[PDB]
Amino acid sequence: DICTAKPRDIPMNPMCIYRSPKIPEATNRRVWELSKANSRFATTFYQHLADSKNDNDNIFLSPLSISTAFAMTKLGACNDTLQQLMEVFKFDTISEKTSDQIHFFFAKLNCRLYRKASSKLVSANRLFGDKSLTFNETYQDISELVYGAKLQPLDAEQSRAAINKWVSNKTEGRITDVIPSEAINELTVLVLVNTIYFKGLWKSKFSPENTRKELFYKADGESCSASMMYQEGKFRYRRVAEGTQVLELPFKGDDITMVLILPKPEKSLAKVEKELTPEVLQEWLDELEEMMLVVHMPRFRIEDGFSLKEQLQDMGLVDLFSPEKSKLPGIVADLYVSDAFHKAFLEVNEEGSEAAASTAVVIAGRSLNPNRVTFKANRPFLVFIREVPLNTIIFMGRVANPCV
Amino acid sequence: VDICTAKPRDIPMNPMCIYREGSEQKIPEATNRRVWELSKANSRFATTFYQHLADSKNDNDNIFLSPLSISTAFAMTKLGACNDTLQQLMEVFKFDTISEKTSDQIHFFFAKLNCRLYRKANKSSKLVSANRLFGDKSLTFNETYQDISELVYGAKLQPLDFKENAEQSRAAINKWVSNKTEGRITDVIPSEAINELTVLVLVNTIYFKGLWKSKFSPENTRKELFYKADGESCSASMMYQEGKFRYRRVAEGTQVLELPFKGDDITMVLILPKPEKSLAKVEKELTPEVLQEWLDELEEMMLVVHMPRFRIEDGFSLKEQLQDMGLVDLFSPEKSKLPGIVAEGRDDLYVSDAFHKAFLEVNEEGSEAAASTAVVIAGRSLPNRVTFKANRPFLVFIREVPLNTIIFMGRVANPCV
Numbered sequence: 043d044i045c046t047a048k049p050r051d052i053p054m055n056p057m058c059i060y061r062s063p064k065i066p067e068a069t070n071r072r073v074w075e076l077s078k079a080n081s082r083f084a085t086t087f088y089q090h091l092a093d094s095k096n097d098n099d100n101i102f103l104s105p106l107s108i109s110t111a112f113a114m115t116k117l118g119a120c121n122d123t124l125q126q127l128m129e130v131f132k133f134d135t136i137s138e139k140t141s142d143q144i145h146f147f148f149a150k151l152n153c154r155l156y157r158k159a160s161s162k163l164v165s166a167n168r169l170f171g172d173k174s175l176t177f178n179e180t181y182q183d184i185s186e187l188v189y190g191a192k193l194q195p196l197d198a199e200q201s202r203a204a205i206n207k208w209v210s211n212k213t214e215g216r217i218t219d220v221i222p223s224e225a226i227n228e229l230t231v232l233v234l235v236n237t238i239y240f241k242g243l244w245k246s247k248f249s250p251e252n253t254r255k256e257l258f259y260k261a262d263g264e265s266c267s268a269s270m271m272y273q274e275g276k277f278r279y280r281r282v283a284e285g286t287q288v289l290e291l292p293f294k295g296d297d298i299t300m301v302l303i304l305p306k307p308e309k310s311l312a313k314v315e316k317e318l319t320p321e322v323l324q325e326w327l328d329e330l331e332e333m334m335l336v337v338h339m340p341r342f343r344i345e346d347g348f349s350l351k352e353q354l355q356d357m358g359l360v361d362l363f364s365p366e367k368s369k370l371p372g373i374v375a376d377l378y379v380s381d382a383f384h385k386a387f388l389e390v391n392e393e394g395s396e397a398a399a400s401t402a403v404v405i406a407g408r409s410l411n412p413n414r415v416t417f418k419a420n421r422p423f424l425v426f427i428r429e430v431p432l433n434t435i436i437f438m439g440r441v442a443n444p445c446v
Numbered sequence: 447v448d449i450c451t452a453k454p455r456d457i458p459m460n461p462m463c464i465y466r467e468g469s470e471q472k473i474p475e476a477t478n479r480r481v482w483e484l485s486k487a488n489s490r491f492a493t494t495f496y497q498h499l500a501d502s503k504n505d506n507d508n509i510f511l512s513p514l515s516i517s518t519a520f521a522m523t524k525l526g527a528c529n530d531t532l533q534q535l536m537e538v539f540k541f542d543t544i545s546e547k548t549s550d551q552i553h554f555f556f557a558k559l560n561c562r563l564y565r566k567a568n569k570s571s572k573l574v575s576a577n578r579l580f581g582d583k584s585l586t587f588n589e590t591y592q593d594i595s596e597l598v599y600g601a602k603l604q605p606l607d608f609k610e611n612a613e614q615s616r617a618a619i620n621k622w623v624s625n626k627t628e629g630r631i632t633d634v635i636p637s638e639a640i641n642e643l644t645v646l647v648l649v650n651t652i653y654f655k656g657l658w659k660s661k662f663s664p665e666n667t668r669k670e671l672f673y674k675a676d677g678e679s680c681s682a683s684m685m686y687q688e689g690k691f692r693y694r695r696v697a698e699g700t701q702v703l704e705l706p707f708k709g710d711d712i713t714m715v716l717i718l719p720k721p722e723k724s725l726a727k728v729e730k731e732l733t734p735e736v737l738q739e740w741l742d743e744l745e746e747m748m749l750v751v752h753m754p755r756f757r758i759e760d761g762f763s764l765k766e767q768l769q770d771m772g773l774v775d776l777f778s779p780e781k782s783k784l785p786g787i788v789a790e791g792r793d794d795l796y797v798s799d800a801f802h803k804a805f806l807e808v809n810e811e812g813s814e815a816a817a818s819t820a821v822v823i824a825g826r827s828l829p830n831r832v833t834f835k836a837n838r839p840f841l842v843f844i845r846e847v848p849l850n851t852i853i854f855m856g857r858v859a860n861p862c863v
């Protein structure tokens with residue numbers, strides 16, 4: 043059991059260790075620390091990601107999800123491979139204890155972010171290794187005990203089937219064909235596979251009988267047709283520094299919410315992206331205050347699938363992806379990382395996330411003031427899916443083009 | 447005798463003057479075909495009168511009344527109606543649009559009608575009525591006029607000294623309506639409307655109060671500002687609820703919701719028009735068929751509901767309006783003809799005027815409402831009341847399920863409570 047056990051009860055330290063030469067109610071000191079650390083990686087990682095993608099391309103990912111994945115291997119990692127892992131993911135800017143049993147506190151942080159009832163948050167993670175080699179039987183245990191499962195041996199394309207089809211089972215169709223038909227080969231050593239997507243309803247719904255057909259202005263200069271939803275009501279909003287508009291739409295339960303961030307018309311979304319930093323992010327989330335504004339927002343489905351390899355290495359995570367430089371004796375009873383794949387899906391509309399249903403919403407007596415605030419997202423804006431009251435960034439993406 | 451369990455061949459009511467494809471059947475279980483028919487033809491006056499009322503008000507003003515009550519009252523008056531005065535009565539109140547066996551006994555079935563609508567049931571949903579005739583302490587009224595009146599409407603003839611004390615007696619009437627309306631309806635008859643020439647006054651009352659089948663939780667109620675047309679703003683207590691309710695996104699993008707009271711025999715029907723479309727557009731499209739149509743269609747559903755916690759009142763002379771429709775002879779010291787009321791003591795009487803008043807209340811616990819109609823014979827002949835201009839209004843109905851009888855109907859424009 044992970045939700046409430048205790049480390050003292052299940053000795054689970056790594057083979058190698060590393061040494062780099064506003065407390066909320068009923069919250070574990072560590073789990074909090076570890077969490078703030080992830081939000082400092084998520085923003086940096088998002089920048090590099092953004093920077094490398096065209097300005098019309100949508101984005102979506104669960105940074106928390108990637109952090110966890112790599113946080114595993116940093117269990118059998120050693121030397122330069124361990125240093126780069128540690129330095130990159132910000133794992134080094136946290137206490138010694140939390141860092142040694144990092145993998146554990148992560149599981150602990152999950153049990154909670156998931157104990158968030160109501161709307162369900164499905165995920166599907168596993169490490170697939172080749173049968174040729176033999177793995178530590180304890181690595182496997184601390185894995186099945188903390189990372190949901192054990193590195194599943196494999197081999198060689200009925201493998202792509204095994205994988206993609208393994209995710210099929212868990213994501214029940216939602217996530218499929220995870221890896222392409224050109225990832226495995228005469229060099230298919232070790233591969234990471236992590237996928238996720240969120241399922242939830244809006245605390246305060248939108249009404250289908252109010253969805254017009256507005257125009258959306260894309261990054262190049264053109265414009266296109268989008269399904270613009272509409273709604274009148276109370277919301278946590280705030281005109282932050284330089285105009286940038288921040289708006290928070292919560293899901294039922296009030297412990298998970300979607301923060302939207304729309305820049306002015308003159309300032310490109312790209313400019314806003316180059317300023318994200320934990321401090322500036324929370325701060326915006328502090329100036330929020332309730333009001334009665336209108337809300338316009340296009341529907342959209344977003345399915346991002348990519349290799350973290352090129353992006354991480356471009357960040358300094360090079361040894362892990364090197365046959366002659368790697369160092370993961372912590373799983374073998376050497377070996378190296380071939381490629382790691384991530385996948386997130388996110389669909390939105392009148393009802394919420396992934397939530398498919400037809401409801402009605404009648405409001406009699408409401409008459410807002412002509413001098414009202416309106417949030418018309420007819421242009422590129424960022425999106426967050428944070429958890430409360432922890433402020434954990436679960437998904438963070440960008441909607442550059444909802445049309446099509 | 448017992449009207450409620452008697453037939454037209456057991457207590458044949460004799461007045462003084464008698465008169466005279468496409469009637470598409472959608473009648474339910476335990477329902478008499480002519481009772482339904484009357485109600486429908488009642489509802490027909492209900493919608494045609496509303497349009498004339500509204501059409502004479504600023505579109506941001508409230509409107510509330512009991513069309514049922516206004517019909518009962520005049521039906522009670524028809525007893526003594528007799529020639530042209532009688533034809534315009536039967537026509538204006540949409541009585542000439544039904545079968546001969548009904549268009550020749552409107553009282554009997556009306557009685558039956560009241561029997562159904564008023565039979566003491568579901569203690570968690572009160573709905574009563576009271577009728578009363580008010581006559582001059584010095585006159586021999588027609589003996590059979592008094593009888594039919596107490597039989598079919600259960601309306602006794604209480605004598606008051608009009609000739610000398612018109613106000614003392616005015617307060618006696620308004621005080622009566624008051625008791626029958628749990629105190630909600632006061633001073634139905636304005637002032638100086640009753641003078642020393644006044645012969646008879648016919649009054650009718652209706653009262654209601656019922657809990658919501660599915661309450662609202664005061665815990666989730668919040669206050670929000672409301673902006674009127676003049677630019678002024680006031681506070682509102684918006685209620686919220688999530689659950690199973692009969693709904694239907696009728697044409698034009700016009701919603702139509704129903705909220706039932708404990709006993710499922712009576713319910714409220716809210717009608718909100720498209721966020722940015724006319725509401726007058728609908729008011730002029732309103733007809734019994736349209737209501738039935740929309741209501742039969744309503745399919746259950748899971749929806750969220752945001753409606754206020756308000757109160758509203760209307761008071762006004764039916765005169766100007768009923769004449770617009772054709773009720774002329776009755777209001778004329780010369781053409782009027784009501785010879786069945788007085789035996790001796792007073793030369794032909796006319797209707798100086800008629801008044802109505804209504805009250806409606808709503809909240810998490812449920813709803814209450816009341817209404818009265820008063821017809822004064824030979825009194826002072828004269829008018830204007832509260833004229834508050836609001837903003838963004840929606841319609842409201844309170845009906846009796848078994849056969850769609852409109853007990854109350856109107857337009858809420860100022861939820862500001």
Ligand SMILES: CO[C@H]1O[C@H](COS(=O)(=O)O)[C@@H](O[C@@H]2O[C@@H](C(=O)O)[C@@H](O[C@H]3O[C@H](COS(=O)(=O)O)[C@@H](O[C@@H]4O[C@H](C(=O)O)[C@@H](O[C@H]5O[C@H](COS(=O)(=O)O)[C@@H](O)[C@H](O)[C@H]5NS(=O)(=O)O)[C@H](O)[C@H]4O)[C@H](OS(=O)(=O)O)[C@H]3NS(=O)(=O)O)[C@H](O)[C@H]2OS(=O)(=O)O)[C@H](O)[C@H]1NS(=O)(=O)O
Nearest residue numbers: 048049050051068069070071072073137138139140150154
């Ligand atoms: C350089 O020294 C470094 O290492 C030494 C030794 O490390 S070793 O253990 O690997 O050998 C470290 O010393 C050791 O660490 C101690 C410590 O963590 O402070 C201590 O850990 C054990 O005892 C802790 C205190 O227990 S308590 O009884 O005093 O509370 C305990 O910490 C508490 O855990 C609970 C918990 O897990 O629930 C926390 O509860 C809080 O959050 C809950 C919800 O959690 S959730 O994740 O948000 O969902 C809420 O339900 C709860 O209400 C809330 N409590 S509240 O008061 O805020 O409301 C509680 O906050 C914590 O204080 C440790 O649990 S643990 O999960 O954090 O590990 C527990 N771990 S255990 O050892 O397995 O039992 C060790 O006893 C201690 O060993 S020692 O020999 O005594 O020194 C040293 O700290 C470390 N320094 S450092 O690395 O630089 O930081």
Ligand SMILES: CO[C@H]1O[C@H](COS(=O)(=O)O)[C@@H](O[C@@H]2O[C@@H](C(=O)O)[C@@H](O[C@H]3O[C@H](COS(=O)(=O)O)[C@@H](O[C@@H]4O[C@H](C(=O)O)[C@@H](O[C@H]5O[C@H](COS(=O)(=O)O)[C@@H](O)[C@H](O)[C@H]5NS(=O)(=O)O)[C@H](O)[C@H]4O)[C@H](OS(=O)(=O)O)[C@H]3NS(=O)(=O)O)[C@H](O)[C@H]2OS(=O)(=O)O)[C@H](O)[C@H]1NS(=O)(=O)O
Nearest residue numbers: 453454455475476477478479481545546547548558559562
């Ligand atoms: C020119 O033709 C026209 O005039 C002639 C003559 O009219 S006259 O009477 O003025 O002279 C009309 O012919 C006469 O009318 C007949 C008729 O009503 O159709 C018929 O009426 C008598 O018999 C009817 C049928 O009885 S039954 O045995 O078949 O049931 C009867 O109608 C029934 O009344 C009951 C009732 O009141 O209980 C109804 O019950 C139904 O509803 C009840 C609840 O009612 S409520 O008010 O909504 O609460 C439920 O409790 C009950 O369960 C339910 N019945 S159920 O089966 O669905 O469950 C029942 O539905 C009716 O059918 C007459 O009662 S009455 O109140 O309607 O008057 C009864 N009246 S009686 O004359 O006193 O006996 C006459 O027999 C007939 O005369 S005749 O010479 O025999 O033909 C002619 O119809 C008319 N044509 S029209 O003007 O164009 O329409």
Ligand SMILES: *[C@@H]1O[C@H](CO)[C@@H](O[C@@H]2O[C@H](CO)[C@@H](O[C@@H]3O[C@H](CO[C@H]4O[C@H](CO)[C@@H](O)[C@H](O)[C@@H]4O)[C@@H](O)[C@H](O[C@H]4O[C@H](CO)[C@@H](O)[C@H](O)[C@@H]4O)[C@@H]3O)[C@H](O)[C@H]2NC(C)=O)[C@H](O)[C@H]1NC(C)=O
Nearest residue numbers: 578604616617618619620621622623624625626627628629
């Ligand atoms: C609308 O409805 C109300 C009631 O529903 C009517 O008002 C009632 O009027 C009657 C008669 O006027 C009242 O009855 C009187 O009760 C007296 C004692 O009751 C009071 O005593 C204490 C006060 O602390 C309380 O326990 C109790 O609730 C009452 O407050 C009797 O003493 C009276 O009897 C005699 O009085 C003198 C005798 O000297 C005579 O003039 C009388 O004829 C009689 O012999 C009397 O019975 C009744 O209390 C009133 N209702 C209430 C409870 O307030 C309205 O009249 C009606 N509207 C109309 C006019 O239609």
Ligand SMILES: *[C@@H]1O[C@H](CO)[C@@H](O[C@@H]2O[C@H](CO)[C@@H](O)[C@H](O)[C@H]2NC(C)=O)[C@H](O)[C@H]1NC(C)=O
Nearest residue numbers: 166206207208209210211212213214215216217
């Ligand atoms: C995915 O694999 C799991 C194996 O754990 C299957 O789950 C079982 O499904 C059957 C019905 O086919 C149930 O009776 C069992 O309760 C499930 N759990 C177990 C432990 O057997 C599942 O069927 C596979 N495929 C999908 C898409 O569900």
Ligand SMILES: *[C@@H]1O[C@H](CO)[C@@H](O[C@@H]2O[C@H](CO)[C@@H](O)[C@H](O)[C@H]2NC(C)=O)[C@H](O)[C@H]1NC(C)=O
Nearest residue numbers: 460461462463588589590591785786788789790
């Ligand atoms: C009171 O009204 C009745 C009529 O409703 C008059 O009495 C008779 O009523 C029958 C039944 O309608 C009629 O056919 C007769 O024409 C009426 N007159 C008579 C006696 O045959 C009665 O006249 C009225 N009272 C007064 C004094 O006018």
Ligand SMILES: *[C@@H]1O[C@H](CO)[C@@H](O)[C@H](O)[C@H]1NC(C)=O
Nearest residue numbers: 058059120121122367368369
């Ligand atoms: C890497 O660092 C470890 C110390 O953790 C050291 O023992 C080892 O020799 C170094 N080189 C390799 C490739 O392991």
Ligand SMILES: *[C@@H]1O[C@H](CO)[C@@H](O)[C@H](O)[C@H]1NC(C)=O
Nearest residue numbers: 462463464465528529530783
């Ligand atoms: C009024 O109607 C009766 C029949 O009801 C008729 O005999 C009488 O002549 C009529 N009088 C008038 C006003 O012409």
